[PDB]
Amino acid sequence: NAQAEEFKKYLETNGIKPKQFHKKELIFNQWDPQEYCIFLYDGITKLTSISENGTIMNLQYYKGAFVIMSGFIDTETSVGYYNLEVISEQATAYVIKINELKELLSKNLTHFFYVFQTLQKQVSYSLAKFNDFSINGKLGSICGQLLILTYVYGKETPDGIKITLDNLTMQELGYSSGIAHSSAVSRIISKLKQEKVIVYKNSCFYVQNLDYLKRYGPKLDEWFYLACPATWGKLN
Amino acid sequence: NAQAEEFKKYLETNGIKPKQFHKKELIFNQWDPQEYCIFLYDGITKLTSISENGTIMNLQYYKGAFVIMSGFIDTETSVGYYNLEVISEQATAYVIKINELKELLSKNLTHFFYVFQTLQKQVSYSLAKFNDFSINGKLGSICGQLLILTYVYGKETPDGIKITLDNLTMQELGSSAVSRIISKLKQEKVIVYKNSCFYVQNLDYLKRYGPKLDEWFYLACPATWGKLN
Ligand code: NA
Ligand code: NA
């Protein structure tokens, strides 16, 4: 990603260093009175909301490169009581305080625009997710996430398009789709297996009917088409 | 809202003037090859999409002041095949081309931040709406959504929190399963009709089932939030 690399160089130029986080660590948390701008350069994370009764809600998933900000750029106050938890084994992020961000993005407008469009990708992603769910329910959400994962991490193998992710637990799949119950997800994931849309052969998932996923996750497909056309065109 | 006034003054002081749109008109549409930055100064609108059936899908509602951009600021291409339809009888909006927008934001970064932070609020709104739905399903979405409408348009009266909105625009804003959830709220005296108006009489019920959108409004609009808490 060119825009993400040039932004990386820009941060290091201005002294900001990368920080290594291991699985289950929180890059930022919902109790910190200080808010940050996280430039997730490598790895996978998820946005959570730990309610008072201890229940963890999974709201969004991110992979580097991307930008996740915990506070409003103007007021510097919380946009929501969320945490950014690492779910890959390791992750690499640049932690920035918001006040420092405004200064940096004011010296270079090109990178300001890079951060600006990451928020736009978020807005349209959520709506797209909500669109597919409204049409095809949980099936649309699951097919949508699997499709996106196939665009990003898919590779050609004799047994279909292999999703090249370590520890892609079937429960990790049911959260980005918007389901907290492992049984209701197990139902759809099994049906997909029975209809041979996917196959779990040795460690990883294999997509076999890619057209099937495009059929029930159309708006998330149109989102990836409009947002990442180069990667989209690899399997279209 | 002072932040929007300065932006208006800023847009006008640089020549950009507003247009007037009318109910059922599209400020932008999913077929135009040119993308725009809409500065919705007044009125109420909805974002719509269309699947390959001719079906209309209501995705999002916006009230002025606010900003709705149809294309990415860097590439200027679509973010999604969306239309911006006017819900209110009339609406006032400034229609800017993304290319023209940039050179404008580049010369007064204070108003760039206003637009930036406006995307932040839209992002957080979607997550809170999704959070409530994941906890209380359609019930949680309806409540959350009525809760915000109460915070924005409500005023305390002897009959409760009156929604100072056209009874027309109200019904335009309120599917069979949804119609029965709303009517059940009416039947249970959460929101009540009286004297040609609607009043919210059990605000706590809405807060109870729209908690994460209730926090969103407190974090995004703490001024208005305090008027009723
Ligand atoms: Na925080
Ligand atoms: Na458009």
Numbering used by the authors:
A (entry chain B): 2 to 237
B (entry chain A): 2 to 175, 183 to 237
Recite the paper's sentences.
The major regulator of virulence factors in L. monocytogenes is the transcription activator PrfA, a member of the Crp/Fnr family of regulators.
In addition, we found three new PrfA mutants in the remaining three strains—Leu to His substitution at residue 140 (PrfAL140H), Ala to Gly substitution at residue 218 (PrfAA218G), and Ala to Val substitution at residue 94 (PrfAA94V). All the previously identified PrfA* mutants, i.e., PrfAG145S, PrfAG145C, and PrfAL140F, could grow in this medium with G-6-P, as could the PrfA mutants PrfAL140H and PrfAA218G, whereas the strain carrying the PrfAA94V mutation was unable to grow. To gain a deeper understanding of the PrfA* mutant proteins, the crystal structures of purified PrfAL140H, PrfAL140F, and PrfAA218G were determined as individual proteins and in complex with the PrfA hly promoter DNA. However, their structures showed that each of the PrfA* variants had only one folded HTH motif, with the remaining structure residing in the PrfAWT conformation. The PrfAL140H, PrfAL140F, and PrfAA218G PrfA* mutants all had a folded HTH motif in one monomer of the homodimer but an uncollapsed central core structure. The most striking structural difference between the inactive, intermediate-active, and fully active structures is the position of their recognition helices. When superimposed on monomer B, the recognition helix in monomer A is shifted up to 6 Å.
